[PDB]
Design a protein around this ligand. Sequence first.
Ligand code: E64
Length: 216
Amino acid sequence: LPENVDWRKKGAVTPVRHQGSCGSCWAFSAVATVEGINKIRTGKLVELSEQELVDCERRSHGCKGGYPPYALEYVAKNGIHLRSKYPYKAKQGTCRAKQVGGPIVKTSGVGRVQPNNEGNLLNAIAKQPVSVVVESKGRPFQLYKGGIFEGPCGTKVEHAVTAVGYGKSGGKGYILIKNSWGTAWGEKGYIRIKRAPGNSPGVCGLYKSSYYPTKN
Ligand SMILES: *[C@@H](C(=O)O)[C@H](O)C(=O)N[C@@H](CC(C)C)C(=O)NCCCCNC(N)=[NH2+]
């Protein structure tokens, strides 16, 4: 395993986006992982539609919160359209997957990493971008402006994000995360969260529930 990994440098990460006031983080996390694996397999970075998921994947609740593994199952089964063909509007509407055209990106399944273990997570990230969860309700997290984040924060997760890398910053290990709150938050939309060693729920509950899409 490499000491440091950063999928941004390998052209596998699209620019940071803004979910607005719609509890759509679950769709944002899911889309970022599929954009990454599509780049890795085909050599092409294309932007995909969070809105298709919000409108069509209904085991989830649209703008009221959802579930990354379900979103990942929807993509493996139905594939997903381009962001330019089915743009994000921060509100749940009628599913138009079959009315919008343009090409579709499809995957072959979805993997579940065994939670609460640093190692399990690092090996998954070394491979590709991973959907991860975190407790974002605390003021420290909302007011984050930079550095290696340590909380204060509990482990009562409620916000899905995307791990696009990991590394070491002079002595402290961290995990590189792509948030969906725009570029004015954190480190140009990103946050480097401290790495809890070995068996642990992770700082702010980061090791609690991780998924990724597979692609032939
Ligand atoms: C995240 C966001 O937009 O910031 C969005 O609320 C979301 O999808 N949250 C998830 C939590 C992550 C997957 C950790 C969520 O809360 N999903 C399902 C809602 C659970 C409903 N709970 C009860 N008690 N009814």
